[PDB]
């Protein structure tokens, strides 16, 4: 079971690398990690779980932030009220295409990864489609907007070894580039 030890923090060499292709099919071993990824969510989201083992709530994680320097993240986004949620574990994501149009949440961003909050907009792109595979080598493509285009976008930033403080703008952190699209959480 993954915990808070196992997160490498803002500092280690291994979030600031560009991580490595998955060869598919995945061995075992990558396999029962990205499958831990994917249970630390759950436990993260369980508040009872969450307490007794003092997770941080997250909704999104990419392998490096274990540091494993490898293609492979895990998203879970429960329903918001729309009936849509999210739960993919995906090998290789790529974004192939995207929208010009810009989106952000309106307090910023957070990450497991880093202690402090850093205050600041994160404009990211509204829509984008991924393609990648999944855990056992199938093909997935997804069409996402707004907030899980956000996480998904976060998740693979990770993989370039791209924080997501470096998108805050330095003089002007709080103001939103023009015609871009405000998300709610
Ligand atoms: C936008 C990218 C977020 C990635 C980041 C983890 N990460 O470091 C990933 O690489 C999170 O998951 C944030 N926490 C979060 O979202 N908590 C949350 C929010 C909503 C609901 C319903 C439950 N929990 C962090 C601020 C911890
Ligand atoms: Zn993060």
Same mark, same amino acid.
């Given at each position: 079971?993954?915990?808070?030890?196992?997160?490498?923090?803002?500092?280690?060499?291994?979030?600031?690398?560009?991580?490595?292709?998955?060869?598919?099919?995945?061995?075992?071993?990558?396999?029962?990690?990205?499958?831990?990824?994917?249970?630390?969510?759950?436990?993260?989201?369980?508040?009872?779980?969450?307490?007794?083992? *003092?997770?941080?709530?997250?909704?999104? +994680?990419?392998? =490096?932030? &274990?540091?494993?320097?490898?293609?492979?993240? %895990?998203? @879970?986004?429960?329903?918001?009220?729309? *009936?849509?949620?999210?739960?993919?574990? +995906?090998?290789? =994501?790529? &974004?192939?295409?995207?929208?010009?149009?810009? %989106?952000? @949440?309106?307090?910023?961003?957070?990450?497991?990864?880093?202690?402090?909050?850093?205050?600041?907009?994160?404009?990211?792109?509204?829509?984008?489609?991924?393609? %990648?595979?999944?855990?056992?080598?199938?093909?997935?493509?997804?069409?996402?907007?707004?907030?899980?285009?956000?996480?998904?976008?976060?998740?693979?930033?990770?993989?370039?070894?791209?924080?997501?403080?470096?998108?805050?703008?330095?003089?002007?952190?709080?103001?939103?580039?023009?015609?871009?699209?405000?998300?709610?959480?």
């Amino acid at each position: 079971m993954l915990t808070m030890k196992d997160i490498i923090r803002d500092g280690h060499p291994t979030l600031r690398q560009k991580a490595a292709e998955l060869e598919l099919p995945l061995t075992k071993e990558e396999k029962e990690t990205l499958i831990a990824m994917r249970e630390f969510l759950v436990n993260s989201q369980d508040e009872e779980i969450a307490k007794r083992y *003092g997770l941080r709530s997250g909704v999104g +994680l990419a392998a =490096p932030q &274990i540091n494993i320097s490898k293609r492979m993240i %895990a998203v @879970l986004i429960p329903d918001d009220g729309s *009936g849509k949620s999210y739960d993919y574990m +995906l090998v290789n =994501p790529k &974004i192939v295409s995207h929208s010009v149009q810009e %989106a952000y @949440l309106p307090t910023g961003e957070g990450c497991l990864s880093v202690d402090d909050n850093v205050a600041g907009l994160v404009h990211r792109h509204n829509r984008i489609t991924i393609k %990648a595979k999944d855990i056992e080598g199938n093909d997935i493509q997804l069409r996402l907007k707004g907030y899980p285009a956000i996480v998904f976008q976060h998740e693979i930033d990770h993989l370039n070894g791209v924080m997501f403080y470096d998108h805050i703008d330095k003089d002007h952190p709080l103001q939103p580039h023009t015609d871009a699209v405000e998300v709610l959480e």
